[PDB]
């Protein structure tokens, strides 16, 4: 039953609130799970699963839910599952990577359906100022998915993790591309980049992060 | 059989009836569809008198006529229990070599399962029995050196104990078990370990080493610092190794003077997790 319910949460996460493929990520805060389609809200759901299974956010391999378990095989089964929950959900590793090796790479574009709550990654072949606008729009879409696409704790974790990289990479990009951006006084590029800056500031704020500012 | 089960001096009656049966021919035709040959009945009585009487004769005929997985269920249950309530399991293993786990002929009870399954099972049990000498006693009584399934379950309980490790002390019972399993590997799966056994034993080495230091490498973005160090963390940190030694220097103020040791530590952690080093040894 331990395995059963934890696997249950596992497939709830991987097939419900989240679907993460190698070029897209959709989140939904609400899921109708099971043959009776009972309603579940992502927020308090993973709130309580975290409190229960991840005291102080870390894997509690000495806890009751693991320490009391007896059958060795199943024990490590459920161990690996809770580890995978931690990584993919308590840490969101796959998407973090996806982001980092996606953000500010030429040839990689990212769309965001806020209505679909889907950050889609894709290949691009635009050049120069066009691919600059493209990657700025893509990063801005990533920030859109941060703000309007994530939960408070989700956004918080993901900011905590990449906002340093966000800051430095977006900064250095703007710097290296200072020529084309300040080429014009009023441009959808400058408008958009000021949007991204304000949005990143609001990200620091809403996320309430201190490890990076 | 059900009637003469509940009698007195039962062992003597079993010896008597078995002495009677010993004169019986190879085959025997019996009354109707439920048919048991004299060799089948003989193996049944042999398992009764020598190995166990837990299952009824009808239960025995069932298991013979049951499904393979069901037979393995029954065998697993049976041995699992007998091991708990025998005085010296070795006796029971000999009994298994004698009636059920004999190769000199096929088993007429567990006609649905091979020796290998049964051995695998009693092995896992033995492990749950934390019984080790028997493991290797077995493996070379039946010559499973570098055998797949035994190696696998070894690795399995290995990673199990490893994932049970809260600290890194040699004197730890869990790590004692792990050391003994690795000894099993060393003695018997030499052809089935490549260098990996090396990685495991340097793993234990580095674990004992760090067990003489203080480490709080636990990236808790809610700020949890009340954390001891579990070995498997390194697997997690597989891609951020020097962060480990960094926290070490962060938390062990004199280890900075100890370039060669720390160096060997990185090297061992690398080699343990098969961390590629494409001449970047200079880098790291």
Curated annotation (Swiss-Prot), chain A:
Coiled coil: none annotated. It is found in: Endoplasmic reticulum membrane. It comes from the Eukaryota. Required for protein transport between the Golgi and the endoplasmic reticulum. May tether coatomer-coated retrograde transport vesicles to the ER membrane through interaction with coatomer as well as the SNARE complex. May contribute to the stabilization of the SNARE complex. Present with 8970 molecules/cell in log phase SD medium. Component of a peripheral membrane protein complex consisting of DSL1, SEC39/DSL3 and TIP20. Bound to a SNARE complex consisting of UFE1, USE1, SEC20 and SEC22 or YKT6 through direct interaction of TIP20 with SEC20. Binds the coatomer complex through direct interaction with RET2/COPD and RET1/COPA. Binds TIP20 and SEC39/DSL3. This is Protein transport protein DSL1. The lineage of its organism: Eukaryota, Fungi, Dikarya, Ascomycota, Saccharomycotina.
Swiss-Prot record, chain B:
It comes from the Eukaryota. It is found in: Endoplasmic reticulum membrane. Component of a peripheral membrane protein complex consisting of DSL1, SEC39/DSL3 and TIP20. Bound to a SNARE complex consisting of UFE1, USE1, SEC20 and SEC22 or YKT6 through direct interaction of TIP20 with SEC20. Interacts with TIP20 and DSL1. Belongs to the SEC39 family. Required for protein transport between the Golgi and the endoplasmic reticulum. May contribute to tethering of coatomer-coated retrograde transport vesicles to the ER membrane through interaction with and stabilization of the SNARE complex. Cells with a reduced level of SEC39 show a defect in post-translational processing of PRC1/CPY. This is Protein transport protein SEC39. It comes from Saccharomyces cerevisiae (strain ATCC 204508 / S288c) (Baker's yeast). The lineage of its organism: Eukaryota, Fungi, Dikarya, Ascomycota, Saccharomycotina. The gene is SEC39.
């Amino acid at each position: 039953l331990h395995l059963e319910l934890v696997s249950t949460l596992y497939k709830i996460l991987t097939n419900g609130f989240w679907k993460i493929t190698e070029n897209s990520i959709q989140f939904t805060p609400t899921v109708e799970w099971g043959k009776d389609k009972v309603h579940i809200e992502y927020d308090t759901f993973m709130d309580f699963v975290a409190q229960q299974y991840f005291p102080k956010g870390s894997l509690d391999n000495q806890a009751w839910f693991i320490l009391d378990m007896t059958s060795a095989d199943s024990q490590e089964q459920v161990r690996a599952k809770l580890n995978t929950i931690m990584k993919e959900y308590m840490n969101l590793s796959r998407i973090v990577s996806m982001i980092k090796n996606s953000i500010f790479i030429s040839g990689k574009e990212i769309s965001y359906e806020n209505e679909k709550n889907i950050l889609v990654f894709s290949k691009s072949s635009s050049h120069g100022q066009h691919c600059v606008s493209t990657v700025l729009t893509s990063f801005e879409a990533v920030c859109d998915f941060m703000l309007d696409g994530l939960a408070f704790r989700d956004r918080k974790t993901l900011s905590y993790e990449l906002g340093p990289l966000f800051n430095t990479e977006f900064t250095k990009f703007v710097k290296n591309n200072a020529s084309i951006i300040l080429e014009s006084l009023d441009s959808p590029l400058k408008n958009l980049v000021s949007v991204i800056n304000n949005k990143l500031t609001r990200l620091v704020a809403k996320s309430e992060v201190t490890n990076w500012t | 059989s059900e009637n003469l089960f509940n009698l007195s001096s039962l062992t003597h009656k079993l010896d008597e009836l078995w002495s009677i049966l010993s004169g019986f021919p190879d085959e025997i035709t019996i009354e109707e569809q439920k048919t048991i040959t004299a060799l089948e009945m003989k193996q049944f009585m042999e398992f009764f008198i020598k190995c166990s009487t837990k299952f009824s004769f009808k239960e025995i005929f069932a298991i013979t006529q049951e499904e393979e997985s069901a037979q393995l269920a029954h065998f697993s249950s049976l041995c699992h229990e007998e091991f708990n309530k025998a005085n010296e399991i070795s006796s029971f293993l000999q009994a298994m070599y004698e009636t059920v786990l004999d190769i000199s002929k096929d088993d007429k009870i567990f006609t649905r399962i091979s020796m290998d399954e049964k051995l695998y099972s009693i092995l896992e049990i033995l492990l749950q029995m934390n019984e080790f000498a028997y493991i290797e006693a077995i493996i070379e009584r039946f010559d499973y050196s570098n055998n797949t399934q035994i190696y696998e379950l070894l690795v399995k309980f290995f990673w199990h104990f490893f994932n049970n490790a809260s600290n890194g002390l040699r004197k730890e019972p869990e790590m004692k078990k792990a050391s003994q399993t690795l000894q099993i590997i060393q003695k018997h799966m030499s052809q089935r370990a490549g260098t990996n056994l090396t990685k495991l034993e340097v793993l234990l080495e580095i674990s004992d080493k760090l067990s003489h230091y203080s480490i709080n490498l636990n990236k808790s973005h809610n700020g949890a610092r009340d954390t001891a160090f579990k070995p498997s963390n390194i697997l997690e940190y597989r891609d951020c190794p020097l962060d480990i030694i960094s926290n070490l220097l962060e938390l062990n103020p004199r280890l900075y003077k100890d370039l060669p040791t720390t160096k060997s530590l990185l090297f061992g952690i690398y080699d343990s997790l098969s961390i590629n080093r494409e001449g970047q040894t200079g880098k790291v």
